[PDB]
């Protein structure tokens, strides 16, 4: 039931950085949304690590993740990043995007249960081909910025088809900034750089609570150069600032 | 309970540096490994003041007085004692700004029977709700020790209070006060006032800190007769926790 308005003035912040991307920003609910580009707002892309939000929920729901206090122990074998070579809580693994932890969660969940949950969450094209431990990173799964906002709003409201306690558990894991009347839940993603004009995708999704208001957001951008990765926070921040939400 | 606690009087340095009489209780992992500057004061019961918004919020949710985590507590536009309270507030907002009148109305609606029931179920201090339903934690007879605060918070952390897990989770997110990728603080302050002649008020800071895969539970109180000393309720514990390598 999304109601969305195109506002091409937001394109300034992309064009100033020679970047192609979309920002969707909704006030209170998906009935009051704006975007710089309607067409791209509905275009589906590889979720990358933004898929740890659904994956954590499904883990809890299935019993793969035993409870909120579980520690994912590092077996000691090297990993693609330093940051990942250590024991991690659920929140820690999410916050540092510890892919290998979530690969193992995915394996244990299995195709049948994963498929069933992505249908219940209306999560993108509910594809999941590639492999069970890679579909959100290099497989066939795709989701739009619009669909991300709708999924995040359902989570915010405990309306996903999952227990309210599992949704709350995953929510505390997403907190990224906290103040007395200002709270951010958010998740980044990054697929990799890409072969000229087969670029990778970067994401920042989440919600901002300020006084008694809530704002849902999703940003993606084409990225062919890892140096441009911080733009996935600066471009949305700048927009949200010009809208007086922050800054 | 089963607390194991050790007195470490080297911690007194931060108190005597500021001429403060007070206690810090700090536990690693569980209440089976705690330390304090003052074992006697660690067990001494004080008025909770606004630290009582943690049990009160849970009880509000449990009884249905607070309908859910998204309820907005609207200001009627009439003078409130602090400017920071003259606005509509979320549950988190009301906790974070210690909006006494929001919680007073919650307490009245909970009522004496249900309030007494939950304080027993939580083993919350002396469980004495005398003094009036809307002010027993501010000026009445309720009293709780730093030791008991740490045990209550540990139960909350673990979702082991006698309350729904969802209600405990709701109040936990309302208490988050500092967030980083592997470092997270949940906490609450309180301040009873400046007291009377020979009869100081009390100030609190209680909470827990998650760092990597560890958790530390803490409770601080101090005697206070002058509002200008109020920042010490955070600065003293912070320095102790810094010197143990936990933060900063």
UniProtKB/Swiss-Prot annotation, chain A:
Inhibition and activation profile: Activated, with respect to most beta-lactam substrates, in the presence of 0.05 M sodium bicarbonate.
Enzyme Commission designation: 3.5.2.6
Native species: Pseudomonas aeruginosa
Quaternary data: Dimer.
Record SUPFAM superfamilies: beta-lactamase/transpeptidase-like (SSF56601)
Primary residence: periplasm
Residues reported to bind a beta-lactam: 97, 188, 190, 232
Keyword annotations: Antibiotic resistance, Disulfide bond, Hydrolase, Periplasm, Plasmid, Signal, Transposable element
One example of a Gene Ontology biological process annotation: response to antibiotic
Pfam families, per database record: Transpeptidase
Domain of life: Bacteria
Active site: 49
Protein name in the entry: Beta-lactamase OXA-10
Effect on the protein upon substituting residue 52 to A: Abolishes catalytic activity
Disulfide bridges in this chain: 26-33
Catalytic activity of the protein: a beta-lactam + H2O = a substituted beta-amino acid
Compartment annotation: Periplasm
pH dependence: Optimum pH is between 6 and 7.
InterPro entries per record: Bact_Transpept/Beta-Lactamase, Beta-lactam/transpept-like, Beta-lactam_class-D_AS, PCN-bd_Tpept
Family: Belongs to the class-D beta-lactamase family.
GO molecular function, one term: penicillin binding
NCBIfam families in the record: bla_class_D_main, blaOXA-10_like
Biological function: Class D beta-lactamase which confers resistance to the beta-lactam antibiotics, including penicillin, carbenicillin and oxacillin, and also some cephalosporins. Confers weak resistance to some carbapenems, in E.coli strain C600Z1. Acts via hydrolysis of the beta-lactam ring. Has penicillin- and cephalosporin-hydrolyzing activities.
Keyword Nucleotide-binding: no
């Amino acid at each position: 039931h999304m109601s969305i308005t195109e506002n091409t003035s937001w394109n300034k912040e992309f064009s100033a950085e020679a970047v192609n991307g979309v920002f969707v920003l909704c006030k209170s609910s998906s009935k009051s949304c704006a975007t710089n580009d309607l067409a791209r707002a509905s275009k589906e892309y590889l979720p990358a690590s933004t898929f740890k939000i659904p994956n954590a929920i499904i883990g809890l729901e299935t019993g793969v993740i035993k409870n909120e206090h579980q520690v994912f122990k590092w077996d000691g074998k090297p990993r693609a990043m330093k940051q990942w070579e250590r024991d991690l809580t659920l929140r820690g693994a999410i916050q540092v995007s510890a892919v290998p932890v979530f690969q193992q969660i995915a394996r244990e969940v299995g195709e049948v249960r994963m498929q069933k949950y992505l249908k219940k969450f209306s999560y993108g094209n509910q594809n999941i081909s590639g492999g069970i431990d890679k579909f959100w990173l290099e497989g066939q799964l795709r989701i739009s910025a619009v669909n991300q906002v709708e999924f995040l709003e359902s989570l915010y409201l405990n309306k996903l088809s999952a227990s309210k306690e599992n949704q709350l558990i995953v929510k505390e894991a997403l907190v990224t900034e906290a103040a007395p009347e200002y709270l951010v839940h958010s998740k980044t993603g990054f697929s990799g750089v890409g072969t000229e004009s087969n670029p990778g995708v970067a994401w920042w999704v989440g919600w901002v609570e300020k006084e008694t208001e809530v704002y849902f957001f999703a940003f993606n951008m084409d990225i062919d150069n890892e140096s441009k990765l911080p733009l996935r926070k600066s471009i949305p921040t700048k927009i949200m600032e010009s809208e007086g939400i922050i800054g």
